[PDB]
Amino acid sequence: SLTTFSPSGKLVQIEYALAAVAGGAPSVGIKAANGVVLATEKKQKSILYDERSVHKVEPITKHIGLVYSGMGPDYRVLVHRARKLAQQYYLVYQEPIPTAQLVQRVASVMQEYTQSGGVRPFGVSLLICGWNEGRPYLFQSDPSGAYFAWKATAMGKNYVNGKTFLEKRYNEDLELEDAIHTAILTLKESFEGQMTEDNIEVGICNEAGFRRLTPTEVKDYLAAIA
Amino acid sequence: LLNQLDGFDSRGDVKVIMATNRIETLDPALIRPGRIDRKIEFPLPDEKTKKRIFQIHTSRMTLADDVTLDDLIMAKDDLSGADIKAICTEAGLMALRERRMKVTNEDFKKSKENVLYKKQEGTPEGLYL
Amino acid sequence: NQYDNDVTVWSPQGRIHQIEYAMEAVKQGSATVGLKSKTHAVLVALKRAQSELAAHQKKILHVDNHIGISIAGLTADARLLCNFMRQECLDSRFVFDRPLPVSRLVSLIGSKTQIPTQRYGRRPYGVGLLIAGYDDMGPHIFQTCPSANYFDCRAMSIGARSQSARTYLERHMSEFMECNLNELVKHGLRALRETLPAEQDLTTKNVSIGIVGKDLEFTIYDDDDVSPFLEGLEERPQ
Amino acid sequence: DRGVNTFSPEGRLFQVEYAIEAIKLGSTAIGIQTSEGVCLAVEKRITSPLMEPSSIEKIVEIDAHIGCAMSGLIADAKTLIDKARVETQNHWFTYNETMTVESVTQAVSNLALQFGEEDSRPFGVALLFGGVDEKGPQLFHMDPSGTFVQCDARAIGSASEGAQSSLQEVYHKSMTLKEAIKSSLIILKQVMEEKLNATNIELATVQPGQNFHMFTKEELEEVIKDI
Amino acid sequence: SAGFDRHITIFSPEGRLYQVEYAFKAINQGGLTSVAVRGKDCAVIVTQKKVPDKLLDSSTVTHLFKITENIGCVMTGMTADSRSQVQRARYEAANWKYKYGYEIPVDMLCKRIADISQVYTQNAEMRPLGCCMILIGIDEEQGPQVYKCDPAGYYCGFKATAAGVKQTESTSFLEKKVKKKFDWTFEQTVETAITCLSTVLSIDFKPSEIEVGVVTVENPKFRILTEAEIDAHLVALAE
Amino acid sequence: GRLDRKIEFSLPDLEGRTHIFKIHARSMSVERDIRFELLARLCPNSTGAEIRSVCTEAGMFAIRARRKIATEKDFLEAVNKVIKSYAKFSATPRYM
Amino acid sequence: TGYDLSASTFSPDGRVFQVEYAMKAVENSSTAIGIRCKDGVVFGVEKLVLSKLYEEGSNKRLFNVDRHVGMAVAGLLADARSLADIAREEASNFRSNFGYNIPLKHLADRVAMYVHAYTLYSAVRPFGCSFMLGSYSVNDGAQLYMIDPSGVSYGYWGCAIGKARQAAKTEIEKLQMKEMTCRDIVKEVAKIIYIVHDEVKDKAFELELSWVGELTNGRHEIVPKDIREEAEKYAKESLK
Amino acid sequence: RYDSRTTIFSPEGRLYQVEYAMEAIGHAGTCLGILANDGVLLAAERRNIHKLLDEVFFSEKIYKLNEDMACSVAGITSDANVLTNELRLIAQRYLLQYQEPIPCEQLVTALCDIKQAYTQFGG
Amino acid sequence: SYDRAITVFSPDGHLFQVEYAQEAVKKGSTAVGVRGRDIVVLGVEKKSVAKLQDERTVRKICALDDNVCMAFAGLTADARIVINRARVECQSHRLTVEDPVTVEYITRYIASLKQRYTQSNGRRPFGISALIVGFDFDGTPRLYQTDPSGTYHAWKANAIGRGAKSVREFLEKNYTDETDDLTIKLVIKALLEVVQSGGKNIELAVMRRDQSLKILNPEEIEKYVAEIEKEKEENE
């Protein structure tokens, strides 16, 4: 189940959770020179659903953005945990928490759920970012408790194809607007043909703080951006 | 064959004893006594017998006495009887390929490890004393 | 039959067989017989031994000044329910300063034995209680079961080959109600002498009798106030 | 049957029957009640010459008039002996008197069969208890299942069938002490395998006038050479 | 597939878990249909009853459970999960009212109920409460709301809402009906609810089988309709 | 008319055992001063042929050492064999 | 046939087989019906003597939970005893916390949640009981409820629990139930119980009748059935 | 055959999870240290050398644990965070208790006792 | 008639896992120990130096008190736990009772801990067997051994580990009733009677019942081997 190793391989219940992550809705996130851009791909099943109720792009503090590619019902749980933990840090130190310390503690929580032996892991991969002390960051986690650091990455359906486009398209030096342009390009590479002001949902991170963009400026920008 | 040996036209004094290598795959029509009474197995020889069959086989070569038979004896602690023969013959071959009289330890290592494939006796266990 | 291991599992015919197995474990005890008149309640059991030289394992044990139980089956659970019984007796004897009515005590016994019959991690109690007592309304003869479905009777008998005893109780339950102590006790052992195979006879050292009375405190007897009880008999009709 | 919390379709003890089977492998012991006093004997089954004979415990001392003998598994016996020692001292604490042997063995069999891993295993030892209460001498025999009974002369462990048979041949109610002692060691050197000498067996006799020192030390040699 | 016999809540290969997608038709063993509609400043619940017995009552077969004085709901699926979920909802709404001093918005309540179902899903050794819940309520600065809560813990909420047995067909009619941009003047809502259930089930029956729960921004209290006015709406749509 | 008793038997406990012990004993050159109940306890569970095999092994010892009245020490070694060195192989010792 | 061991697990088609097997456990139990009138609720249980070993007055399935509420259980008896104790405890908490008589809806909902909580987890089994709950109040009238082994608790006019669940309510529902006071309904329940299973599979049975309503001024007790003796002088007239 | 959990022994007797944890060691990053007085060094292999990382951590295998001790690591990565935090906390509790740095062998045996506490228990 | 675990009896009345955890002891390194009348002596074989490390931390002989000495076999981690708890226990005995610790008390503790560890739910038995040698009461030399079952068992000489039957057979064929010179030479003969007796893998430590532990030096042992070879030549 979760208490015993394989004959030679790895932790099959974590590999299956990673497969369930890879079978999820796509997303892309890019670290630029001044800011970080996050973008998801949010298709309603019918024409009935409302786009003002559930939110993918979600702030953790006033300057720390966070998206995922997986299951919202676990996402909200570990979001609430990260909320309470970041506010506990700000109680202790009276200073807004740095993103590396967030990723350490969130990874500790996810690791504690990967421990034995009755609870399942999260089927959630994060993409954490923030602008702490001038230089912005970007930290991807996974259900296995691990974490990384990216310049630009993707997660979801066709993340391999989107990543091979990211390797070709992106570079080291851009601004936030060019980052949004290449981000909607690489999300538009893999999403469905009808992409509107509601099928995507985009938040950015300036050094002036986190900013979650509106459907007004999202519809203004993606009105045939190239 | 059964009706002949231990059935009709019985033994009298006709010593036809049946030894084997396994114990399992046989028809129990003869496992019952009468057909055959006693049974014996064979372990592999021990250190006391390891040095014995070493000196038996290592005698076939002008031994470089600096090589440690006891290391071969404890490492190869499950030498049925083929490795010993094969190992010493191939050690002599390794050496006398160079036409040397003595057989350095490395030649014994190579001889045995060629003879001794697929041997991993470490952990487990491997992880104790 | 692979569903037939634990207490928790309902059967596909709905009969939890752990209860049936506990019943069958009760069926392999010693024979014992309890029966009451209008004024006196008598329970009589049968002793056995491990060998010839050893003493006999006792069955009638004391509980309280007006409560005594018979037993069949396991002995650890017997003494466990004995200690719980004495405890609940001295609890109400402390608090209310009265003797207990028997029915609420046996309801507490059923509620005690309910928990090991429903959760996982305890076995049902192999137990053969025959309870005699005195509330304000006279003698009571109750019996229990490992399924905690306690019964009230006027004459029962549990243990090994106790069915011929039940036939005797059928053909004398009308006659039981009128008599005094002595012929009542000899009706009890005219059940016990049919709880035995016919080629041997009930002796002194193997039988036990416990009388509780409306003015008489519960008292156990062994061989010496039983030598008066064993005479006044004829042979079996061979 | 696998497990202490499941009965049988018929009437099997399992978690206990396999313990009653596990008694049978142990060394033998024989205790005999006589109104003069309780005698007791055991076999050590010494394996090595390095095996120091006085270190193997079979007869231990519970009280100044209460002896013991063990069987089968060693350490369950060690547990029960330790607790039995503790509780008799508690009785002497709250009563200024000696806990009688029936009360001792009820105090042992309160938890001699009380094995529960939740809410541990059943014990693997048979015990022979001898002592002198106010009713004279007493000889007592319990089991792993707590089914405790009095026995006049009980034999345990290995070869107990022929021990009981040849014991019931010679025994009666009005025996004497020394006759029962030599009758016991006759049964012993019919059921043991090695030559009977000074180091194999050990006796334990308790008398009402000789409550102290329930043991015979190398006058046992003089007892053996009288056969 | 399985293989693994899906006995507990783990992850199977490629890639789903089977316990929750078996719980999604514990609704389907209810044998019941529910439809919610939001067009305008009102909100309408409609749900029928399946009472074959004359010995059985009619008041206590009600599925519309008034959660608070401004929040209603309806339940489908098995009854015990539904009623226990309803008392959890009432208890947590009262907890909101105690802790925070004002009336709970219907969004936070669905979030809290979804979180309870997720905790019942995350930890094993508990059955995942196989019932589905639709909520309605009025909120200031947002108008009316209609929400749905899943047994999985996936809340959502939207304009024309339906769950139960036959609601692929109901959502097919609500895609073929909520596509024209007319307003929904409350009798448009009642008429479309009655006729959508009347086209999905195709029965065209007495006013005594369906239950209608409404809430409106003129009286924000939750309100259950009477046989007379249900009959009035039914013959008002009778042409 | 065909078969009408339906008898059965299995391993006797020790009495038929001891009897067969003595049977095979007097059936060969043995020592009379030996007992059987001791040997019987040694015998956990066996057929007469197995027991006969014990007798054969005692004979094997008496072939090794010049024995005429096969002693219970010859039978002791034979028991060591049959019930420990032949209980299955040897896998009992090294824990009392 | 595949997965029906635990009470936590689901099936490939989505139901819990533990609950079904516990539901049809009570089907083998004795037949117990109930019906209310316009001023009371009447219980009635077909109770059987084993052979000749009973005492006619032991182990009565007609319990008495509150001053105005009693049970009419059928199924495993000891589980019903424990559940009756839980119901007594719940009425005790309500009487201690609010100072007046428990409404039957609230009592039934607490009991249904308790039964559902024993159906939820995997350590425990579902109950093997199915019982009736009747009441009466001066401001509420007569209320008769019904709790299955699963925990679905709602209301009836008449019911039946046992073997003849359909075979009682076939002719229960042809009773003019509203216009009768319960003193007619006593012999009505007598004839309904007496119709089912006179001698066919078993040998003999025996009748108990519980009784609550306005005529008891809100009390609940067994009838003095020997008073007016309404079964037998009509049971012997119900065979023709 | 006798697989199921970390406890109990195999029939020879060996262990299951111990060898399989070793075979979980075998597919990881390579470390070493060298024989030197007046200094000591460490070597480490970079896993995941892909071009789109950051390398802003200054340390992926090394963990400077107290002041005058670092440690490399190999194996499953995220167990080591639990171990390194606890190890730092052990050495720091020692320094709190004595105001003398930890003499490193009771530190090593403390971590070995932490690991052995999960070797014995079950499951 | 199943497999797991250590709570189930066999169909014929055994515990498989006590016997099976004895096998790890039966296949471990050898260590012997004898008592002289005033000086006690023991030692381990198989130093097994891998040419490139230190060995002062791998010492298989330690002490709990100034009177008692240790040894073990089997796997070493269980020895580490038992020794750690044994030091604590010996010191806790020193806390109440003001005596020097008797060897019999600490052996009863080791066997009691080992058995209550074996009885419980799913705890793996300690696959060791210790040798506990000390001389306290009037300087009386004692040595006891243990078992995974938990049976302290007093001897006069001992042999454990690999091929212990042969080694104990030599102590059997030596062990004369008829002086720390014969005891030193007896240690030399025991280590010469080792399974390998390489001459450099010999590690021995003694105690003269008033002193502390003395670790010897492998030149004195070389002269011991030389006088053993001299006596072997004098046999001819």
Ligand SMILES: Nc1ncnc2c1ncn2[C@@H]1O[C@H](COP(=O)(O)OP(=O)(O)OP(O)(O)=S)[C@@H](O)[C@H]1O
């Ligand atoms: N009950 C017995 N009485 C006397 N001798 C016996 C007895 N049982 C076995 N033996 C002896 O042991 C040997 C065993 O032979 P069998 O008993 O014929 O073998 P078997 O395999 O049991 O024969 P089957 O299969 O039941 S026909 C015989 O040669 C007998 O002399």
